[PDB]
Amino acid sequence: MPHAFKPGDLVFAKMKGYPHWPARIDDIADGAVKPPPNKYPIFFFGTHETAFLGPKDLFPYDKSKDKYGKPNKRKGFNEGLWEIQNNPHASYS
Numbered sequence: 001m002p003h004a005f006k007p008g009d010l011v012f013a014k015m016k017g018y019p020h021w022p023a024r025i026d027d028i029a030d031g032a033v034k035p036p037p038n039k040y041p042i043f044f045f046g047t048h049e050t051a052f053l054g055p056k057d058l059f060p061y062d063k064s065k066d067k068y069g070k071p072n073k074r075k076g077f078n079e080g081l082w083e084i085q086n087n088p089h090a091s092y093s
């Protein structure tokens with residue numbers, strides 16, 4: 001049975017106006033800015049951008065990859081597909 005989301009989990013994350021996007025739940029470094037309540041820090045592969053999202057916009061990657069893991073015209077998306085498949089827990093800083 002599913003647990004709550006935790007740092008390191010792999011997802012497709014949905015933002016308004018963008019396709020479901022390969023991403024991970026990030027940790028928060030000591031001294032770093034914390035997300036709002038009920039929000040997680042999402043790192044988006046390919047773009048390497050961070051936004052704060054709740055579970056309604058988070059699709060676990062294993063279940064969802066057949067549907068959402070296909071190339072997209074959008075900037076950074078196909079780099080992002082490589083990262084989530086090949087080195088999803090690397091430093092991209």
Ligand SMILES: Cc1cc([C@@H]2CCCN2S(C)(=O)=O)no1
Binds near residue numbers: 029030031032
């Ligand atoms: C992670 C992380 C944060 C830091 C900074 C700089 C030195 C002390 N800290 S802090 C202000 O206590 O977060 N080092 O590693």
